[PDB]
Amino acid sequence: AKIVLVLYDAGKHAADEEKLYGCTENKLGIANWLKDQGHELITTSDKEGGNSVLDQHIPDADIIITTPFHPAYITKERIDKAKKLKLVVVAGVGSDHIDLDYINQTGKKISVLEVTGSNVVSVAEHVVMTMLVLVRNFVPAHEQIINHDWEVAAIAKDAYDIEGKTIATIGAGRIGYRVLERLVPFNPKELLYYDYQALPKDAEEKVGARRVENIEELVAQADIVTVNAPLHAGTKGLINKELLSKFKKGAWLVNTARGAICVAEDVAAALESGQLRGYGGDVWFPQPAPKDHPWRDMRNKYGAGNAMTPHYSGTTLDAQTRYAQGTVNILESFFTGKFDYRPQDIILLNGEY
């Protein structure tokens, strides 16, 4: 079987860290396994333009493996040319780069699987970390040290404890809930959530969570807001100038979900105005963020309140090990003809939901 694996080139970084499975140099740790089984593995980061290594191999690829961290766009056009395509894998979680709709609507016999649950802890930790960084004003504090300064009042004047804050999640899916779980022993004033359906009463109670009917009422009472929902018609451009005006004045906002859920210039304005005290997270639109993206240079009135990182929260080394293992499991399920996939991993099975 011919497998096309699309990942980024990690360059010298792959040489520094053998556990960095998720790059072209290290090949998810599956190269020898595939070779020993008689399979042909094409690994490439070249995924854009008709001339690309990806497109060269598409016509006779049996399997394509992709990553949200360097997503090969498995478009209608590519699917149509992929005459032997049987399985598309996401070595991680997130599938917007694959035209699931097209596969399902046509009824093409193509399975699409991802390593469900493998990303969740990593992102949830990143959220709580980012909350803490922002609320406790860590960034300018650290900057003082490395700049050979020491002016405690300059930091203290905008530093709080997370204790006694009201904390709101937009979305209480796997990540949102794991964030709430992690926030419990921090003794927030209250944990709150908005979602299209309720958490079960026992789940709500385990984290002391209260359901708020609408986002406007949710954000109005929240010291801290975190976005943990997918990008869709209900969430695209959700965090805009209008909704931001409904936030608590000097609220902190974290988004490790999708960049497009925010209107980027609206967030920058709100931070600079004091409507937000801080913003952080690792997701951008466009992504990778251009060098000029407003979220890079945006600061609050004190020159802080920015806890942005490149998009990496779900690709820690621990997450990458789970992605690599999960990819092997999926591939073994396929190669053996068992198709004994983990039910949660199945996005489409031979084109069906």
Added chain:
Amino acid sequence: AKIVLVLYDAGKHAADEEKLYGCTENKLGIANWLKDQGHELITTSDKEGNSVLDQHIPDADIIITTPFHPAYITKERIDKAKKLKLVVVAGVGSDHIDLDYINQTGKKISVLEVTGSNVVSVAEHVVMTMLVLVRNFVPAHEQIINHDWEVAAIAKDAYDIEGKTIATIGAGRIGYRVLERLVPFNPKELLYYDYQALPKDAEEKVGARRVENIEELVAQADIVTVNAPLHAGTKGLINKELLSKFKKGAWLVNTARGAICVAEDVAAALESGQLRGYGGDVWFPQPAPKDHPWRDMRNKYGAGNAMTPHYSGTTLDAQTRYAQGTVNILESFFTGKFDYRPQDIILLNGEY
């Protein structure tokens, strides 16, 4: 009564933030409370050198200090303080007060601090610092603001805190609250070393296992955090010998006292990879000199440093607790009820 309150000048920052109580400009938010009660308040930052503190010491009934800008209540000052009845720390930490001398004199001076008021603030700082180091946040943010984007450069040394073995040296108020906050992160195990056991049911609440000696503790730990007082057993505890027994690539956090570490030994361990990261907000000497080795030290990747100035206990939330607790102490004294919170007492009329 005459109350001398020794803080620091926050300058323009005091005007920026009204909840910044711990500075001379804002006078713990007690200046009017004190005047309304008929007391005289002297506020100064001048504590070195005929300094203003020294001018007022001879007839101060009460001196209020802050551990963040400590006025040293020295042997000489105790001698000169003819009316001294009460010394208060608007916060927690009494290193700057010669308690041994006060006790020795037989003078009826109470010394109180707002016990418990800094604990959550420091505990949060610890867990934050752990996450920042483990998840490799510092170089990640630096990329963004440097207009770069190279995920692999960050990911190559970024881990989840989940599945890590985490150890605290000391399981007192801060140490225990750190452990409590770590529980839902699913660590492989939470461990502690201390001179006394956690009460059984507190031990079981965080799933902690006691380790009998420090060497054994640090040898199995992915992350170590220092939450012990500075004394004979802990001064220079974290030296090159002990560090060489750390798990290779461990993360170390210290928000307790700078002097529990040997500064150059920690820096050496970070540069060599014995530590993957070091963080915390305590320094020795403090404030840190401009070339203090902990400022510039990095792991081989140019990261592994999550140092801050000494501010974890200075958050606005803690400062509110300090101001309120200082009111509580003062009013217990003023009313002559002396109905102090038992945990606030360091000396009661000179006695431990």
